[PDB]
């Protein structure tokens, strides 16, 4: 039983991506202080406890599923698509999300507001003519007051429907007051859609749409995410735990039940001695 660890994560042979102050979802959305993680790839995304959000207050229904699938894909490669939003104002911003000195927003999301004095029924489409899945991250803006709702979206109650040939997903934004977060009582709800090859994405919305700017290229492989504060080191190790890298020569380990790579099986016993010699009978 291997019961001790070096306390550091070896950076080989696996591609380790240390997420400094950034969570995977914040790096996905395009949080300003996460801009260094654009187009990054990883075998293991190490997510630190010091990570925080510093953009528009948002909320992911089924956060764990999105985090799991993004981690499994193992890449943040983002392809910008040409979305034609007619009759609305693109690139909306906020002071809760300060990119540089001025107001900003998530780099992978497009906050569409009314243009002039109208907000038409947006109806856009993108086909998937590639041979890989496309991940689309979109949002719904929940305003704090009806005045804000009608000032951004002329409709008193918008809705956002994102659909493909096989499935659909509709969200009705709600207007209500919420806990103060970075200066705002409003929220963003983050939803995702996977468009399979040979399918089509149709986005039909009449208000409160945080539109996508493109798609994330979905992949399949050995990628995962881990919550650990262990520092990264320059060394070779096949088995990573939140406690650091551990040798895998022993068949069992007692360091941590969370593992990545060629790891020993986790057991509750802290020691198991295997006899490699005869029964010891000393003199006298």
């Amino acid at each position, epitope marked *: 039983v291997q019961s001790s660890s070096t*306390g550091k994560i070896c950076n080989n042979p696996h591609r380790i991506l240390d997420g400094i102050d950034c969570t995977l979802i914040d790096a996905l959305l395009g949080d300003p202080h996460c801009d260094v993680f654009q187009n990054e790839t990883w075998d293991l995304f190490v997510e630190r*406890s*010091k990570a925080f959000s510093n953009c528009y207050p948002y909320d992911v229904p089924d956060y764990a599923s999105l985090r799991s699938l993004v981690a499994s894909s193992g890449t943040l490669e983002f392809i910008t698509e040409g979305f034609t939003w007619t009759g609305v104002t693109q690139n909306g911003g906020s002071n809760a999300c300060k990119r540089g000195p001025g107001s900003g927003f998530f780099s992978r999301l497009n906050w569409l507001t009314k243009s002039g004095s109208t907000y038409p029924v947006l109806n856009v489409t993108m086909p998937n003519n590639d041979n890989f899945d496309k991940l689309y991250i979109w949002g719904v803006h929940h305003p704090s007051t009806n005045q804000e709702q009608t000032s951004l979206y002329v409709q008193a109650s918008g809705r956002v429907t994102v659909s493909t040939r096989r499935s659909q997903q509709t969200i009705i934004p709600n207007i209500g007051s919420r806990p103060w977060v970075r200066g705002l009582s409003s929220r963003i709800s983050i939803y995702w859609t996977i468009v399979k090859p040979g399918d089509v994405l149709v986005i039909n919305s009449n208000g409160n749409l945080i539109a996508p700017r493109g798609y994330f290229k979905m992949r399949t492989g050995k990628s995962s995410i881990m*919550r650990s*504060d*262990a*520092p990264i080191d320059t060394c070779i190790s096949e088995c990573i735990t939140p*406690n650091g890298s551990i040798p895998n020569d022993k068949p069992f380990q007692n360091v*941590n039940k969370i593992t990545y790579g060629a790891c020993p099986k986790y057991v509750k016993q802290n020691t198991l001695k295997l006899a490699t010699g005869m029964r010891n009978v000393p003199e006298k």
Partner: antibody
Amino acid sequence: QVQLVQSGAEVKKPGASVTVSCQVSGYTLTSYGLSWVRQAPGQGLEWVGWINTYDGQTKYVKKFQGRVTMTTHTGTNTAYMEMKSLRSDDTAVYYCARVEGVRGVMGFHYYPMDVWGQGTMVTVSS
Amino acid sequence: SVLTQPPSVSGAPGQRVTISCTGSSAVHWYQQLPGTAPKLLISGNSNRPSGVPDRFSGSKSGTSASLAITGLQAEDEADYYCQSSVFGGGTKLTVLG
């Protein structure tokens, strides 16, 4: 900004117990561990101990085992260090300092104390 | 794991200062200005934290770390500690005329 505001000066009597509080601001208390460091007046810094916020496991110097207890109040983002059976040599300025690791490792093995409190002068003698 | 370092480096403003902590076993360097809380100024073993001028530098041999302050002035002069738990003895920085 990140700040650790400590309590006021405590003037105690030998054999009593004292409690020093550290109110953290600008971040979530459970995102970082917290070390407590003593400095006797003009005698250099002395590490007292370490509280792992988010799971409550402690680490104390053997000199302080049994007579020091560190706790946290997540509701108010506060951390408390209580020293029982006070002695004369415990007269010192006590600092709370922010350390990074809480999950997977004990942070003080690998990370520094980047943010410090203003210190409370706990004087137990006259 | 006893840490040691050479105390009471006395010097005028504007030149080299070298402090040497010999770990007997991650060493970080803290500055305590008089009547102020200690401030971290060398993370890792050679890394500088945010807001600390590039004048400060750290260097690690096999078991000896050294902190170098360049062009020191009034605020650079303080009491300096190495940390690895254990602190160093402490070396005072004083101005010289």
